[PDB]
Amino acid sequence: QDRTYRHHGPEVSGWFSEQLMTGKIPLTEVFVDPITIISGIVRQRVIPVYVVNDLEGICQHIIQAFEAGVDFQDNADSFLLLLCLHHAYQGDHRLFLKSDAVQYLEGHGFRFEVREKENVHRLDELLPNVTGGKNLRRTLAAMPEEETTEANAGQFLSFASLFLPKLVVGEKACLEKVQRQIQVHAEQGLIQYPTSWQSVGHMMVIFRLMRTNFLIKFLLIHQGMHMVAGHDANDTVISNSVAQARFSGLLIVKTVLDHILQKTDLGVRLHPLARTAKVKNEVSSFKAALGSLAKHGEYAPFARLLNLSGVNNLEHGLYPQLSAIALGVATAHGSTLAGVNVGEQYQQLREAATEAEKQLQQ
């Protein structure tokens, strides 16, 4: 039986482009084409891992500190880690230190050092230093030992996760997304957060925290993907939040990639118009950018959210020719690509792709 040639068009499913961006399919399947201590610099970020009795109590104090609008400038990691330790790992810090997630973080220069504190009076005791900013230490010491918060570590984390999906868009779009999502979860009877948390003041505090702190974002993403069973109401929210945040700030370039990929009866390949000499330079840079992205594996889809290096090179605007081919193919199927606009200079390439597609549809 000879070849039954069939044209199926672009990979609008998004499956193939996802595998390419997460390193599960090598880029050579579609495309073609050591740093030393004396040459490079690695910034180590030491994160104290405080083992403590009454981890619940300390977590309540941490929550109440955030509720009071306390701004942990760059000493938030230790306290935020205790929240994640208490909720996700239920106290077991040693199991966490063995995770593949910690190994990945050690790639980012993170160094987790355990520090045993038999008993700590308050949060001021968990930030020892003779030189650092003392405004926080005095503030944390000024915090009352009174229990005031209505929530727990789980709710704080699930609430924070709501900021992930639209974090990269801006403060207005993010907060509005949080508000809508809170209503969805509340109406469906999944979770109900404290009233005071939904105030503009409190939401702004959590927004500034999420936007500046890499670790809390990563740990939520870690929890959302690698939690396999025993899901709380909180775990469910977190998993849903992380799922929605997938490829946030990368959706446009991803659809461009989808439409420059062509599927036939033989398999998937790059669009012929993308294989011309005129565009080979753009494809080379694009492959290099995807390669840098794919090294992050299962964390690649949150690359723009986590502000990983090189992700700026994935803005579709940098690839007008590929965008043109992508839109050219899209328009042939009566479809359109959101956020993609081809200038007059590339319309000829755009029309060529359109005419090419409507030709192949036999």
Residue numbers in the entry: -13 to 19, 28 to 356
List passages from the publication reporting this PDB structure:
The ebolavirus nucleoprotein (NP) is the most abundant protein in infected cells and is essential for viral transcription and replication; thus, it represents an attractive target for therapeutic intervention. Ebolaviruses are filamentous enveloped viruses that contain a negative-sense RNA genome of ∼19 kb.
The capacity of many NNS viruses to prevent premature NP polymerization via the N-terminal domain of the phosphoprotein prompted us to express and purify the chaperone domain of SUDV VP35(1-49) fused to the SUDV NPcore region (residues 34 to 367). Purification of this heterodimer complex allowed us to report the crystal structure of SUDV VP35-NPcore to 2.3-Å resolution. Here, we present the structure of SUDV NP in complex with the amino-terminal portion of the phosphoprotein VP35 at 2.3 Å. This structure captures VP35 chaperoning SUDV NP in a monomeric and RNA-free state. The structure revealed the characteristic bi-lobed configuration expected of the filovirus NP with an RNA-binding cleft in between. The SUDV NPcore contains two major domains, an N-lobe (residues 34 to 340) and a C-lobe (residues 341 to 367), both of which are predominantly α-helical. In this interaction, residues H10 to P12 of VP35 form a beta hairpin (β1), which is stabilized through main-chain hydrogen bonds by a longer beta sheet formed by β4 and β5 of NP. The medial part of VP35, residues S15 to L22, adopts an extended helical conformation (α1) located near the interface defined by the N- and C-lobes of NP. However, the comparison of these structures also revealed two previously unknown interactions between SUDV VP35 and NP: a hydrogen bond (VP35:R5-NP:D275) and a structured beta strand (β1) that complements a beta loop in NP formed by β4 and β5. Importantly, replacement of the amino acid residues involved in the beta strand interaction (VP35:H10G/G11P/P12G) resulted in a dramatic decrease in the dissociation constant (KD of ∼1.34 × 10−5 M). This result suggests that the newly visualized beta sheet interaction is essential for maintaining high-affinity binding between SUDV NP and VP35. NP is maintained in a monomeric and RNA-free state as VP35 occupies this hydrophobic pocket.
